[PDB]
Symmetry: C3
Subunit: 671 residues, 3 copies
Amino acid sequence: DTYAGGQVATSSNVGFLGSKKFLDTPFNTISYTDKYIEDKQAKDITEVIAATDPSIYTNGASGGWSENYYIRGYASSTNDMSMNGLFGITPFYRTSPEMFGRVEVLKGPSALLNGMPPAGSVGGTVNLVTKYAADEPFARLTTTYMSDAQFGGHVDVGRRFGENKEFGVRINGMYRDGDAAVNDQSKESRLFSLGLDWQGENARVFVDAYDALDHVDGVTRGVNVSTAVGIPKPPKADTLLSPDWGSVETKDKGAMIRGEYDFSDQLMAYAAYGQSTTEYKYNGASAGTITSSTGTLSSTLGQLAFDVDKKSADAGFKGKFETGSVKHQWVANATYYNHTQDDYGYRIIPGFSDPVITNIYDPNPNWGPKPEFTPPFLFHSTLSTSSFGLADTLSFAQDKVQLTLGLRHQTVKATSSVNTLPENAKSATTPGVALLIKATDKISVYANYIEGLTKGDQAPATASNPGEIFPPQKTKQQELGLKVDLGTFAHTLSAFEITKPSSYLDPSKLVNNLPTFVSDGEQRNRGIEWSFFGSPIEHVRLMGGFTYLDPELTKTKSGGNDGHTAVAVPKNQAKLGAEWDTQVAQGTLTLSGNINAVSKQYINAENTLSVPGRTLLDVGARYSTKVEDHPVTFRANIYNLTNKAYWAQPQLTNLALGAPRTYMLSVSYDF
Amino acid sequence: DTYAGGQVATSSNVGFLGSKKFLDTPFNTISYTDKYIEDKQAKDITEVIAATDPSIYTNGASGGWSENYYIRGYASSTNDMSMNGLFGITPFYRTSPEMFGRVEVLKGPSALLNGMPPAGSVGGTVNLVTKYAADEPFARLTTTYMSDAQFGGHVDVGRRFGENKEFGVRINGMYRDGDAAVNDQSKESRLFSLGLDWQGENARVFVDAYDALDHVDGVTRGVNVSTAVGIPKPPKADTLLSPDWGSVETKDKGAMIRGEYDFSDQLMAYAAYGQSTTEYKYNGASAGTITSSTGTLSSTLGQLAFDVDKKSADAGFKGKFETGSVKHQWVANATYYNHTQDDYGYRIIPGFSDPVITNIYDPNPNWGPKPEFTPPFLFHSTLSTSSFGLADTLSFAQDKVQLTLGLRHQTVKATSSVNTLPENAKSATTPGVALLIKATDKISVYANYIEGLTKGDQAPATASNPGEIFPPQKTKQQELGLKVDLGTFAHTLSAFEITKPSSYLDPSKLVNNLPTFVSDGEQRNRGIEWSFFGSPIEHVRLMGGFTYLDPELTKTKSGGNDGHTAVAVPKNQAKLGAEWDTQVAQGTLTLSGNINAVSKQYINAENTLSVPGRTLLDVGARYSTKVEDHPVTFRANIYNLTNKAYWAQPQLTNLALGAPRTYMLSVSYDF
Amino acid sequence: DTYAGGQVATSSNVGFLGSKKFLDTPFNTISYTDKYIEDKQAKDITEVIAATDPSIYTNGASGGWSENYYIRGYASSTNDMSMNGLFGITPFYRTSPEMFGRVEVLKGPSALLNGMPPAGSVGGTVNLVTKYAADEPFARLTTTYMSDAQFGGHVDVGRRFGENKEFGVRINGMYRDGDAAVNDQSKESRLFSLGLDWQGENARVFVDAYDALDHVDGVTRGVNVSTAVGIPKPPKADTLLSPDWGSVETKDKGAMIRGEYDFSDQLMAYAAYGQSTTEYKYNGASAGTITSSTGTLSSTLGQLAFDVDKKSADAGFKGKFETGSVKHQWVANATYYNHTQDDYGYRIIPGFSDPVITNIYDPNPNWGPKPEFTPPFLFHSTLSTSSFGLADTLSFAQDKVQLTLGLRHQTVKATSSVNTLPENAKSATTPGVALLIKATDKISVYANYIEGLTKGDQAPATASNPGEIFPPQKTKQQELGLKVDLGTFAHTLSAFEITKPSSYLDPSKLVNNLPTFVSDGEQRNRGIEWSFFGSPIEHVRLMGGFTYLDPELTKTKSGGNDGHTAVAVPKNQAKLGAEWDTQVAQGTLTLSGNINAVSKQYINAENTLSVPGRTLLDVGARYSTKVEDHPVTFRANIYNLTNKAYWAQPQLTNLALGAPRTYMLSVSYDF
Ligand SMILES: [Fe+3]
Ligand SMILES: [Fe+3]
Ligand SMILES: [Fe+3]
């Protein structure tokens, strides 16, 4: 399954179409292996998928309250990841990757394939494939360090049972804790995970469960700027611009089961059910605001807790048939998601309502006392979605021309206990079509049209159309692409256009002498991507590429920002990761380097504030050997080697500092 | 004599008990070789004994007015090192290790073995073993660099003379000078040493003499904090928080002679005599005080000069005999120490009594003009100590059970030319017992009781018992331990409890309605130590360990701080040094790493101020080859490679910054 | 022609004496190859000639308005470089080295050999040798990075044509652009160069042409200090202490043609003609002035543009003959140089005459608005020089004793459109003599006397001798030296004394009771140099040395500064570059290090202000291999590894910051 280099896989899950090979997939897809994950010493999903992929962008801050990445220049919510194809299971805001055998990315929207994930983001789909027991018994201990003083370990054990090894058990345990690379920031993570499987003759069952904790002391929340004051030069990269006593914690627990049954080699049924819980707590700043070019910062304090219970299901049939010399491979499915949620919080903390005044350049800021965590209950809320989908792939001319057609019907309903406005389900129907031509056994050309869905907004009580709930809103993609597998090295070249609508109150459209709430907003992302992976010569691995992105606000409230560039995302990215192997005594030495170059990003939609591009370097070394015939691997990594200080745009606030120089060490031992 | 790896020796000097092997020593001991010293590029004793020993702690500042280390959580004064078993010879405050073939540490107090050293510290004994000429003629030149701009060299030459090579001459010369790694700090060091020996048939003589200079411009004195104001975040690690014009200089000259005479193979006499002089001069801050959380620093200035003339002697008899199936190995000795001293100084410098006001975060502090060095005479003082000791080691069962019993009488008298209060000698008797059992010839189990002595304090004129001089005060240790030599790798596991008394004026104990001066104070250090050294597999060296220490103030003035943790020392330490060798062309390449991790330390005895734990990394590379058949070694080291900024507690002031990232290069050539 | 190591050449151009080997040259000479240039990733000439040569000093600032270096402690103007032996062709202020096969240095003045270059500097002659097409067709692409975000590429292609490959074409293209290592400083460079040659039977023609751009945004201009205020501690090294909006741009275009004609093997004629244009523009600060010890900076603004059109020619004969057993090798030449120039500028910009007030330690300075570039015409000026020269080298004993004698007559005239005072040509005659003795074929001993010329000054209207124009002023050198070629490693040891006159109006020397304009000023530089290059052991390269310099102001106006040390230059330099090669897989791994240590430098001629010595470290790695038999080289370099912040003296202002830590990457591929 793994490609030359061991770092990328040759197939991925293309939503409900299932497992498809690189050259057979009319979408831009990549799948990273657990080997790559361990080689990066990746602590979250971002560190896996953003490192070498020029169609993915992160603001790159350390110890935020969530991960933050864009795919094809649109937000891709952490809420919207799948586990073994199923949504609503993964951790809410940050996921440590120890329990996954693959991390797969499908770029662009995919409503036909996947339906509408819970946060309705459209950038792309990240699918996390869990670990199951290999045939050979297995036990690996890894110890980890990260600067300044974060220590941890990870145990991974697998064994199969029964006379034909038809049962599997795979267990992962991980703990790490201590000060991180940012001043007064510490990071705690815990994971316990279970992967069980039964391989029957005509039937298969897979069970996965996990218990996870993510905790940051000195969480980074970021800061707001104005045009009046402007953006001052970034403090040094290890500065924390949020309260030192501020903290965030997320506890995530999840479990799922998949069953498959082969009726024949022309018909299979499958079902997947799962559930998860999230507990989020945050005590710290809601925002810092830079109020002077001398670096004065005004911070308001807030608290939030929320608890969410999630359930989800996906069941269907796959089959094959032939019509003359045309082979048909079809799938039909139904999906369900439900959550209930309680939110507690303060916008204004009693006794702590005055803003805390500091300066961004002060080495010893006074953040004041830490308020007790007592957020009062705010509201109960729910979300339900369901979908029914159908697709067929027609293969002509000895499978050299493959046409996929499908449609999905999607329903969604949200409720809130402080909403007096009407609450009603709404529905939309989303098609997709993809065409793939194998010009040779090494070269595929492909095109697709496909959509993404986002829950419709509700017009406020101040509108001509008060309380109107829009149907799910259609993001629309067209894509043309070329894929080349040279044998050990592979190239993708793809161009895309994706339009995403938005909704707003429009004063220019008067109905009963009132402003009308409309879905007339639009952002249009046009992009070219060239990317590559594998081994272009022996003992060398190379992964990366180049993208040009034009993210344009084509239609905005009152036309003010028509033709402007979208905030946050760069127009140009270039990324290269390279590894070089050489034999040294009784082992392999690998040297690694990464470069990550991006252009400037706008901070507001008026395009009157921006931050420059930056180029970041990383280096690593890896030594793999044996001690008394036990495999041993040593790994050292430095990220942001030049300790470049830069602003970039996080969620909810305008700016945050990128992560500083960070050292990571790990040693692993196979029992 | 040297253990596998070349870096540690298999025997050490156990006070007047003489040379004993690792498995035969009922104390926790380690001896480092000159090879280790050269490999660390150690510039002082601290860099030798603290690097991998988790029972030793230093605050780790660069360019202090002295070394500073604790052993088993108690101060071990630089004044209290021995040279070839004799006290009062070594440099007063800092010692560059070029002239030593071994640096030996015995952990815990050792009054029975060693008597009371001049400063009466009880943490451990550091014994410096000088170089003598090996049989083969020898000449090595080494050139040294340390960042930023310190250049130096060291010559080591030895030759033996006479027809049976019964005379030896060994000469060491060293100079280095230039800017160090701390801003505005420069370090000058000079050493000339002589080791002469004569090996007769029934007699031996050893002579050692040295002339040393230590000079620091921009000496670090450290800074004081209060509970009202608190401890601000450390400036960057290369900041100097003392006057840039401040300096310290110590000139040390010493010489000693040892003679041995064998009457038979059952009786030997020995005598050792030596003397030394110290000239200390300091012009700079007495203390910085942090007077605001913005980092305002108020620095008072002081000057000190003192001259001290020292004489030292140790003479006795050792013998063996048998009574039944019990072997006896006994010693009886007498020791003498005397110094005379003049002190000159200002507590208040005329024209410079106003503190200099700076801010600890200022890149451009104004330290004002440098006052002329004109300290006036303050007082003449003397210290005399003498002891008489007896010990016997009884061996049973083919030397598999060894019981040591001993006691020592200790006398001490101090005088001062400005003391109106009585001056009298005082005395104490200190016993010791140790038991060692060789379970196998690889495994020893041991236990000891032994004491340390400290000069008694004198009650002030304001007391109910005015002018009373206490006898030498007894620190008391109990220890249980286990040692294991696997062949090329060795373990020690030991547990200990050490109580140290203190004296104070007690307002709560009234006699004739006046406060009484009492010796009722107590600190109790309980510890577990696991440490190891050698080569656990081929081409690997590993040295380090783990300690837990509970240093508790069990009895304090008025009971205020009863149950508190002692200042300055961490409760937890983990240290690991590792080296890996590989063949590379015509030579051996060694890669090295060190980690040093400690937990938090309290800054006051009220335990209301503390500083966090910190982890420091070091890396090295070493290449040993030949050029035209002449051995050549290249050494490169980076210490504190993450350039971690941290506060820790020095002598006399509350806080000082740890040393920054420091680069060291050396090349050595054998003629 | 290249020495062991590939980095230095064995011959260089000794002015009109032509190509001479190392052991045949009675001057201190070195020639660096394009291989060395590529290995250093050199971006200007300074980075080639200053890195390892202890007789060369630069202040080392990043992004100045010109290069700045001294040779033997005297300014060597960038104006005064030669291209293939001809002056007035090279870029005016900064030269990127991509078009050169050699960079050659002759130390000390050389008027006999070279005449008077346009700026009349006397430190040394830098000669840049252009690239011509090798026999085998050639194409190399190189991509470059420099921190923070400067990217570039260089193409080098050559082919020969005709049946005997008697025509050659060699083309170089280079572009780089982006943010450099200094905050808010960007650097753009462009080069297109052409080297054409025809090799006939009796005759040869070489044509060279280039078009170059140098552009800096955030140009560093430096800052002035006073004795009243003093010199504060340097800000961090990547600080820009000139306006962020300030910029300099130079466009340089040049072309030259050389013809040679062999009349016989004993007589050759040659002629060279060339021209170049320079357009310089500068908009920014004229000076910052540090007006308080807290770091207050007062910056005045100015603008300058100048256009200069240059023409130059050199024609002559070389011949040999023998009379008895004495060989004669003679040369005779005539040289011409002319430039016309227009200057536009503001000393005071209308509407921007108020100084901009900042602080050198401010992370976020306000530099105010950028004034429109509108400098008005100031004056037209011209410079003409001509010379004729004759020299003979008399040799015997197979050239093992060589005596060189010569004379050159030099004429110069300057005009200016704002000079009312007389304008007249003036002349001087300058001799030279050198002696070389080959003690062996490995050892040469040599001595020389030779002069440098500088245009005479004109007495002001306030003098006794108003309007008098002095003749060309004679700098005078005497030198004694020793060269040793051991085979693969070479040494030079030389001692020199150079006196350089200056002129001033002297109130102490009255004629008709008026001050007299005199040439009574003198600076005298005495030096010892030990330097070396090549491979002392297999797989090692070593290049560097040590110099002591005594640069004394021996005679100054009024005698105030008599006996003081000259500004800007250190008295002591030590430089060492080392490379170590290891075979690994199918390629060579090279590791490199550089150290550069200098002593303190005076900032004023009163010698009441100075800045300390500093030591800088650099490290590098290089991997050279083949991919499908195509040569590939990877290079990584860090310069100023410790990121030392230091002041040094640039042109026109008192101080500027040295360049910060700078990372450089390049990859080259041969088609
Ligand atoms: Fe919120
Ligand atoms: Fe004192
Ligand atoms: Fe000027």
